[PDB]
Amino acid sequence: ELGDRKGKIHIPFPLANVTCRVPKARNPTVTYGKNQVIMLLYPDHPTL
């Protein structure tokens, strides 16, 4: 015995943009050559 009769209440914990502290990949073993650069990459996790 009701159609679309409804109420509304405000809800806690909203989404908000913040700041996160991440890390940085370790520097690779770099060796120079004639117009070329050689890098020995050692990643702990998938690194781009």
Binding site: Y32, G33, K34, N35
Partner: protein, 49 residues
């Protein structure tokens, strides 16, 4: 700085092996003769003109 009868030491950069260049000190020009030699490294870590 200049005074009278003296000399001056200057540092210069070039790419040519045989370099004939004019240096304008104050308002008068002087001809410089230089036979530059190749460097030990083929690849450098800083840009130039």
């Amino acid at each position: 700085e200049v005074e009278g009868n003296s000399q001056l030491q200057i540092s210069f950069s070039t790419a040519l092996a045989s370099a004939e260049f004019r240096v304008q000190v104050c308002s008068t020009q002087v001809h410089c003769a230089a036979e530059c030699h190749p460097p030990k490294d083929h690849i450098v870590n800083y840009p130039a003109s």
